[PDB]
Amino acid sequence: IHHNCTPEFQANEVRKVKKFEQGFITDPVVLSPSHTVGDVLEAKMRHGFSGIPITETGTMGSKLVGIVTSRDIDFLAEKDHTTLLVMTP
Amino acid sequence: YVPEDGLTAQQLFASADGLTYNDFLILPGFIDFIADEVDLTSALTRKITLKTPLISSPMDTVTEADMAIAMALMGGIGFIHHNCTPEFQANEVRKVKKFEQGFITDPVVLSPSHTVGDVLEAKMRHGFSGIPITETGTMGSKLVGIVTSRDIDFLAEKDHTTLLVMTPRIELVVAPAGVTLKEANEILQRSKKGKLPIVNDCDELVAIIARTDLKKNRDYPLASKDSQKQLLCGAAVGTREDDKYRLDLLTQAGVDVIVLDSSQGNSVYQIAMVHYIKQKYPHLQVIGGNVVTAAQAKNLIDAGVDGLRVGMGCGSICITQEVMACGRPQGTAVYKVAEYARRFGVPIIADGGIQTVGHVVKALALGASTVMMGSLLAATTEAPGEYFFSDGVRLKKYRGMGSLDAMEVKIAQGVSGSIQDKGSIQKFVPYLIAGIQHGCQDIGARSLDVLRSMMYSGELKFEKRTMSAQIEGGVHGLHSYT
Amino acid sequence: GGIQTVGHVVKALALGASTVMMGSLLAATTEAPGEYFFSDGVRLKKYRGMGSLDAMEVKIAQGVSGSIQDKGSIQKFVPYLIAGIQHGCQDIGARSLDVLRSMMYSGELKFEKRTMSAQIEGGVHGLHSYT
Amino acid sequence: YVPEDGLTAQQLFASADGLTYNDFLILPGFIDFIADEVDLTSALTRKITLKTPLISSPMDTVTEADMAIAMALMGGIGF
Ligand SMILES: NC(=O)c1ccc[n+]([C@@H]2O[C@H](COP(=O)([O-])OP(=O)(O)OC[C@H]3O[C@@H](n4cnc5c(N)ncnc54)[C@H](O)[C@@H]3O)[C@@H](O)[C@H]2O)c1
Ligand SMILES: Nc1ncnc2c1ncn2[C@@H]1O[C@H](COP(=O)(O)OP(=O)(O)OP(=O)(O)O)[C@@H](O)[C@H]1O
Ligand SMILES: Nc1ncnc2c1ncn2[C@@H]1O[C@H](COP(=O)(O)OP(=O)(O)OP(=O)(O)O)[C@@H](O)[C@H]1O
Ligand SMILES: Nc1ncnc2c1ncn2[C@@H]1O[C@H](COP(=O)(O)OP(=O)(O)OP(=O)(O)O)[C@@H](O)[C@H]1O
Ligand SMILES: O=c1[nH]cnc2c1ncn2[C@@H]1O[C@H](COP(=O)(O)O)[C@@H](O)[C@H]1O
Ligand SMILES: O=c1[nH]cnc2c1ncn2[C@@H]1O[C@H](COP(=O)(O)O)[C@@H](O)[C@H]1O
C-alpha cells in the first residue's frame, strides 16, 4: 500500500486487505429498526444495493432483529416514509 | 369597430399558387382557457373515433405490433404494413389485439419431462428463466410447477436431469382467471414472488404476470379500445387477387380497420376491392387509397369507403413527382379534398410531408380529421429494426415502400435512408400532444372540432409567407446555436 | 434541351411536343463517343456543348465542357425510360400520347403550379442520409 | 356533381410567369388499364413515325453510328 495519503487512510486500506474473506461481505451496511424506508432507499441510491440487515443498535455486534430488501420496499407508496419494523422479524 | 385582418381559407386558396404548409401561417385569436383544456377527439372513419389525431404509417420501417400497441395506448392507432407474409401480418395483428397491461403475451412454457438444459437454453435465447411448467408443456392444461434461476442456479454443470428442480403445484401461489391488477398487486405484495400464474378452476394455466412488469405499471386514460376493451389495430392491404386470402386471415385475427394501400386510389382495381370487402365483411371499416382531388374522391365515396387517405408526392422518402410528373402540393390537396368530403360525412387523413408540430396544426386547421406520420415516428424504440451506429450516432433504417430494397424492369418510386434515434413513443407522443394543445390555445380553439368550424365559418384567418418571411420565421443571425 | 428526368419527358409530351431530344441523359453511355476515364475512382465521359471553345477547333463561347458519370448501355437505359413514361401516362389516365395531347387541348387535362416550398416538398427531404 | 379542380394549360400559361418544367405538375385522373397497354407512337416529321418519342442529340459527345443504331433498335432515332 502506498503512503501518498493519510496514516488513518492507509491503515484502513491494510485492515480491508487483512480482514478479507472469500464469499463474505466486508464491512456490511446495517441499520436500526428505528430507521425509515427513506434510509433504505438512500442506501440503495448511494451504494447500489438494498439487502440491508437490521440490528437492535443499528450496527454489528448486537442482537439481530430482521432484514429489509427490495421486495420488502418495492410496493410501498412514494409518500410513505414510515419506520422499519416492512422488516421481516 | 375593428376592421378584419388576414384571409379566410377560401381566399387563401383562390389564387391557385400551389401552397404547402410552409407557405402560410395562422393568425392568433383570443385566449380565455388553458392549453390542457383543449380537446383532441378525432374521427378516423364513419364509425371509429380516437382521442388523439396521430397515426403511424403502414410502412415496414415504422409500424409493427409494438408500435401499434404503443400508439393505441397513447391514444392514436397503427396500421400494420403488408410487405410481409399474410400469416406474419395476421400474427402481428393478433399480438396487438390480445395485449393486456401488466400481463405477459405468449408466455414460454415447458413440460415436466424437459431438462434443465432446456431451461438454460430458454434463458440464453430469450433473456429470462421464470418459466412455468404444465402437464402437456403448453397453455391450456393442468399446471404442475414453475422453475426459475434460484431453482437452476446451484446445480452442477454436468447435470442435465429432467425437471420435476420444479416446485410442485401444491406449493404455488396462483390466482383465478378473473384477476384484476389490484388483486395481483395485493397477492404479489403478500407473497414476495417474482411470478404470478393465473389458472382455471381445474388448474389449467391461462395467464401469468411478472413482478418486474407489474412494478412498471402506468395509467393510460386515452387508450383506443373496442367493445371488448382490446386495443384497436389497423392493417394495410393491396388490390390484387392474393389480397383476398390476406383479408381473410386479418379478419380472423380481429382487425378493426383496413386501409387500401396505393399511390393512386382512383382505379377500377380499388373500386372492385372496396365493393368486395363491403359485400363479404359488411362490419369492416375501409379507408380508400391515396387521392389528391375531389373527382378522385367521388368515385371512392360512391364505392362505399369510410375514410380517405390524402397525399401524393409529399412524403419525405418520395420521388414520385420527379419520376411521374403527378401529384399536388399537400396543403392545397388537404383543403380541397376535406372541403368536398365533409359534405358526405367522410373524414380524411393527411398523409405525408409532416415534419413539425406546426405542420400537424396546419393540417388539422385545413380540415383534416387525422394526421399520419412516417418520418417523425421513425427511429423510435418501438419502430421495427435494430439500431446501428454510423460516426457515433444511433440510427435506424427508414425506407419508402417504393424503394428497390422494399421490392425484393421495376421503377423505383422511393428512397432508403436513416433517422437519428428519438427515444420511446410513450415519451415522444405526449410532447406532440402538448405542442398541438399550445397551438390550439394560441389560435383560440378549445377543440379541433371548434378549430375546423372556425375555419369553415371564416372566423379563422391566415397570412401567406414570402421566402424572406420564411427565413425570418426560423433561426437566423447567430454564430452558433443548439 | 433541359430534360433531366422522366417527369420532364412526360411534361414535355403533355405540353404538346411530339418527340423529345436528350443530350445529357444519353451521355456517358457505352454507345456514346469517347473513351471512358477515371477521376477519383468514378468512370466518366466527356460531355461538351457545340458552342464550347474546344468544339470550335475573336470567337465567343456559348457552351461549356464537362463530364457525366457512366450509365451502362442504351439498350438497358432506354426501356427504363419507356417504363417510366408508361407509368406516368397511366397515373394521368392516358392510354396513348395522342390521347394525352388531345386531353390537354380539350381542357380535360389539369395542372397545378408549384411554389418553391412545394418544389422542396416534392423532393427528398428530412433524412440524415439516403442513397 | 363534382366541381372542377386545377387549371387547363391555357389557364396555366395565361399569367405569363416564365414557367419551366419544375414550376408545375399534372393532376391524376382515372385508371382503367395497365401501364404496358400505353401506346407511345410519335410523329417525327410530316412523314416519319416512330414507336418511341426519344431522340439522341446531334452532338459530338452523344451521337455517332453506334448510338444511332442502338436508338433505332430501341425504337427512337439518332442524328
Ligand atoms: N401516395 C404516395 O405518396 C405514394 C407514392 C408512391 C408510392 N407509395 C407507396 O409505395 C407503395 C407502392 O404502391 P404502388 O403505387 O406501386 O401500388 P400498386 O400496387 O397499386 O401499383 C403498382 C401497379 O400495379 C397496378 N395494379 C394494382 N392492382 C392491380 C390489379 N388488380 N390488376 C392489375 N394491375 C394492378 C397499378 O395500377 C399500378 O400500375 C405503397 O406502399 C404505396 O402506398 C405512396
Ligand atoms: N448489506 C450489504 N452490505 C454490503 N454489501 C452488500 C450488502 N448487500 C449487498 N451488497 C453487495 O451488493 C452486491 C449486489 O447485491 P445482491 O445482488 O446480492 O442483492 P441486493 O443487495 O438485494 O441487490 P438489489 O437491491 O439490486 O436487489 C453483493 O454482491 C454485495 O457485494
Ligand atoms: N415465462 C415467461 N414468458 C414470457 N416472458 C417472460 C417470462 N418470464 C419472464 N418474462 C419476461 O422477461 C422479463 C424479465 O423477467 P423478470 O425479471 O420478471 O424475471 P425472470 O424471468 O426470473 O428473469 P431472470 O432469469 O433474469 O431472473 C419480464 O418482464 C417478462 O417480460
Ligand atoms: N408464484 C410463485 N409461487 C411460489 N413460488 C414461486 C412463485 N414464483 C416464483 N417462485 C419461486 O420463488 C423462488 C425464487 O424465484 P423468483 O422467481 O421469485 O426469483 P428469481 O428470478 O429466481 O430470482 P432473482 O430475482 O434473484 O433473479 C423460486 O424457488 C421460484 O420457483
Ligand atoms: O416509396 C414510396 N414512394 C413515394 N411515397 C411513399 C413511399 N412509401 C410511403 N410513401 C408515402 O409517404 C408517407 C410517409 O410520410 P413521411 O415519411 O412522413 O413524409 C407514407 O405514409 C406514404 O403515403
Ligand atoms: O454549346 C452549346 N451552347 C448552348 N446550347 C447547346 C450547345 N450545344 C448543344 N446545345 C443545345 O442543348 C441541347 C442539349 O440538351 P441537354 O444537354 O440535355 O440539356 C442540344 O440538343 C442543343 O439544342
Side-chain angles (χ1 to χ4, degrees):
Chain A
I1 309 296
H2 76 248
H3 75 306
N4 200 20
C5 57
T6 311
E8 282 81 12
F9 172 97
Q10 213 193 10
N12 181 54
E13 217 91 34
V14 169
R15 183 202 59 70
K16 281 189 287 186
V17 174
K18 288 302 299 178
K19 281 174 154 56
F20 167 96
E21 217 95 61
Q22 210 216 327
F24 291 66
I25 287 159
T26 53
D27 309 328
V29 173
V30 186
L31 294 169
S32 88
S34 59
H35 276 93
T36 73
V37 295
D39 301 291
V40 177
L41 264 74
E42 286 298 333
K44 167 58 180 182
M45 189 277 264
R46 75 184 59 200
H47 295 150
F49 56 84
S50 195
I52 295 161
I54 311 303
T55 326
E56 278 204 331
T57 62
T59 187
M60 316 264 313
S62 63
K63 279 190 171 185
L64 180 70
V65 289
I67 188 158
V68 172
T69 79
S70 298
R71 292 192 181 192
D72 306 320
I73 289 291
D74 55 349
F75 276 104
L76 269 55
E78 299 188 328
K79 189 177 174 181
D80 198 351
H81 291 76
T82 190
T83 67
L84 309 179
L85 162 57
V86 178
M87 170 261 255
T88 177
Chain B
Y1 168 84
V2 86
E4 282 170 11
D5 231 4
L7 306 170
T8 68
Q10 159 135 318
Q11 291 163 350
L12 178 64
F13 294 99
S15 212
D17 273 50
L19 311 179
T20 59
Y21 296 131
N22 278 346
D23 289 315
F24 70 91
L25 286 163
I26 304 158
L27 290 168
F30 178 61
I31 300 188
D32 45 346
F33 54 86
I34 65 143
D36 288 333
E37 288 180 64
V38 168
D39 184 5
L40 301 190
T41 55
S42 302
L44 185 66
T45 80
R46 303 242 196 189
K47 296 306 224 290
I48 305 167
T49 318
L50 307 170
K51 291 169 177 72
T52 295
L54 297 316
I55 299 157
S56 193
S57 180
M59 283 155 85
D60 66 22
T61 53
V62 187
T63 312
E64 310 266 30
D66 256 355
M67 167 72 70
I69 287 155
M71 281 316 277
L73 288 167
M74 281 321 72
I77 191 168
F79 279 87
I80 309 296
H81 76 248
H82 75 306
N83 201 20
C84 57
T85 311
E87 282 81 12
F88 172 97
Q89 213 193 10
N91 181 54
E92 217 91 40
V93 169
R94 183 202 59 70
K95 281 189 287 186
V96 174
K97 288 302 299 178
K98 281 174 154 55
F99 167 97
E100 217 95 62
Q101 210 216 327
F103 292 66
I104 287 159
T105 53
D106 309 328
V108 172
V109 186
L110 302 167
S111 78
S113 58
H114 290 44
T115 73
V116 295
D118 301 291
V119 177
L120 264 74
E121 286 299 333
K123 167 58 180 182
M124 189 274 270
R125 74 185 59 200
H126 295 150
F128 56 84
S129 195
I131 295 161
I133 311 303
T134 325
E135 278 204 331
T136 62
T138 186
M139 316 262 308
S141 63
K142 279 190 170 185
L143 180 70
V144 289
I146 188 158
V147 172
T148 79
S149 298
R150 292 192 181 192
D151 306 320
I152 289 291
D153 55 349
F154 276 104
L155 269 55
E157 299 188 328
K158 189 177 174 181
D159 197 351
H160 291 77
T161 190
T162 67
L163 309 179
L164 162 57
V165 179
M166 170 261 255
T167 177
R169 167 60 181 91
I170 282 67
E171 206 69 20
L172 294 181
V173 173
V174 303
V179 184
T180 181
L181 291 189
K182 291 177 182 174
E183 295 301 319
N185 271 262
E186 196 276 333
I187 291 166
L188 277 190
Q189 180 173 270
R190 272 197 303 94
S191 212
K192 308 281 171 61
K193 321 310 299 183
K195 295 298 193 294
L196 176 50
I198 299 166
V199 297
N200 197 26
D201 299 347
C202 65
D203 303 297
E204 283 157 324
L205 175 69
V206 292
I208 184 152
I209 291 169
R211 189 196 197 83
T212 291
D213 279 308
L214 199 68
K215 286 207 297 280
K216 305 174 183 181
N217 200 52
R218 285 203 289 265
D219 183 18
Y220 300 100
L222 302 178
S224 308
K225 317 298 230 330
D226 68 32
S227 70
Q228 321 310 136
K229 247 63 145 193
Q230 297 312 120
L231 299 178
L232 297 178
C233 201
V237 171
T239 39
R240 308 271 191 172
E241 281 292 335
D242 304 336
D243 289 288
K244 308 279 181 66
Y245 187 62
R246 193 183 286 274
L247 200 74
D248 259 298
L249 295 191
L250 298 160
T251 278
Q252 290 147 12
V255 77
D256 304 286
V257 59
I258 292 291
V259 62
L260 295 183
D261 191 41
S262 80
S263 183
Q264 213 290 28
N266 194 36
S267 68
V268 290
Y269 313 126
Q270 189 156 127
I271 291 159
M273 184 52 76
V274 170
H275 280 294
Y276 166 77
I277 297 166
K278 301 262 132 202
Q279 153 252 330
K280 187 149 152 242
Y281 305 132
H283 68 283
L284 195 58
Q285 297 284 286
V286 191
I287 298 161
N290 269 284
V291 303
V292 287
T293 277
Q296 288 181 279
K298 195 199 99 104
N299 278 348
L300 292 176
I301 287 169
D302 279 334
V305 302
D306 313 290
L308 288 168
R309 203 173 157 196
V310 176
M312 162 183 233
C314 41
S316 62
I317 41 62
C318 180
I319 61 166
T320 291
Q321 285 173 12
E322 265 101 342
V323 181
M324 314 276 90
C326 214
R328 198 165 203 170
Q330 178 63 328
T332 307
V334 165
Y335 170 80
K336 298 294 178 177
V337 167
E339 199 275 322
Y340 179 70
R342 88 205 162 97
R343 277 161 245 201
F344 313 89
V346 178
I348 69 126
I349 307 104
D351 167 43
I354 298 285
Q355 339 171 51
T356 63
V357 157
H359 288 166
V360 179
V361 175
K362 280 168 181 168
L364 297 166
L366 288 178
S369 294
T370 48
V371 175
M372 188 186 291
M373 288 144 303
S375 191
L376 267 174
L377 308 183
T380 55
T381 78
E382 297 78 349
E386 67 283 341
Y387 286 91
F388 66 97
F389 288 75
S390 193
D391 313 75
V393 56
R394 278 159 60 90
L395 308 163
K396 274 213 182 178
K397 190 192 294 289
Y398 183 62
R399 80 217 190 141
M401 299 297 252
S403 294
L404 297 178
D405 304 327
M407 257 60 165
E408 288 297 285
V409 51
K410 61 223 296 178
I411 305 291
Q413 274 196 84
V415 303
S416 62
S418 311
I419 302 284
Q420 180 173 346
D421 165 38
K422 262 137 79 162
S424 188
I425 284 288
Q426 282 191 50
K427 219 54 64 213
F428 191 72
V429 160
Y431 155 74
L432 304 172
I433 287 167
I436 295 157
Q437 284 181 306
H438 274 118
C440 285
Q441 193 221 29
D442 265 347
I443 282 149
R446 45 161 73 241
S447 70
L448 297 172
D449 262 41
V450 156
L451 177 67
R452 281 180 293 273
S453 73
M454 267 153 85
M455 186 274 292
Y456 280 124
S457 81
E459 174 160 16
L460 206 57
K461 291 299 199 297
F462 308 78
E463 176 137 310
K464 296 188 193 179
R465 317 209 274 155
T466 74
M467 189 60 13
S468 272
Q470 289 170 234
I471 287 158
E472 195 201 49
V475 180
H476 60 90
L478 312 189
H479 189 268
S480 62
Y481 74 103
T482 47
Chain C
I3 298 285
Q4 339 171 51
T5 63
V6 157
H8 288 166
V9 179
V10 175
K11 280 168 181 168
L13 297 166
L15 288 178
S18 294
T19 48
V20 175
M21 188 187 291
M22 288 144 303
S24 192
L25 269 174
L26 308 182
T29 54
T30 41
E31 296 76 352
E35 67 283 341
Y36 286 91
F37 66 97
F38 288 75
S39 193
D40 313 75
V42 55
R43 278 159 60 90
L44 308 163
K45 274 213 182 178
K46 190 192 295 289
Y47 183 62
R48 80 217 190 141
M50 299 297 252
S52 294
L53 297 178
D54 304 327
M56 257 60 165
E57 288 297 285
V58 51
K59 61 223 296 178
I60 305 291
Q62 274 196 84
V64 303
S65 62
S67 311
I68 302 284
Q69 181 173 346
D70 164 37
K71 323 186 175 183
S73 186
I74 284 287
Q75 279 183 69
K76 222 48 63 203
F77 192 71
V78 160
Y80 155 74
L81 304 172
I82 287 167
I85 295 157
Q86 284 181 307
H87 274 119
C89 285
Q90 193 221 29
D91 265 347
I92 282 149
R95 45 161 73 241
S96 70
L97 297 172
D98 262 41
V99 157
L100 177 67
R101 281 180 293 273
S102 73
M103 267 153 85
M104 186 274 292
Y105 280 125
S106 81
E108 174 160 16
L109 206 57
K110 291 299 198 297
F111 308 78
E112 176 137 310
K113 296 188 193 179
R114 316 209 274 155
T115 74
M116 183 63 13
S117 271
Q119 288 170 236
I120 287 158
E121 195 201 49
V124 180
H125 60 90
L127 312 190
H128 189 268
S129 61
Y130 74 103
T131 47
Chain D
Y1 168 84
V2 86
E4 282 170 11
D5 231 4
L7 306 170
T8 68
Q10 159 135 318
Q11 291 163 350
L12 178 64
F13 294 99
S15 212
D17 273 49
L19 311 179
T20 59
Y21 296 131
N22 278 346
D23 289 315
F24 70 91
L25 286 163
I26 304 159
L27 291 168
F30 178 61
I31 300 188
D32 45 346
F33 54 86
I34 65 144
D36 288 332
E37 288 180 64
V38 168
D39 184 6
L40 302 190
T41 37
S42 303
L44 185 66
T45 80
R46 303 242 196 189
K47 296 306 224 290
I48 305 167
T49 317
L50 307 170
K51 291 169 177 72
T52 295
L54 297 315
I55 299 157
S56 193
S57 180
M59 283 155 85
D60 65 22
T61 53
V62 187
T63 312
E64 310 266 30
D66 256 355
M67 167 72 70
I69 287 155
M71 280 316 277
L73 288 167
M74 281 321 72
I77 191 168
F79 279 87

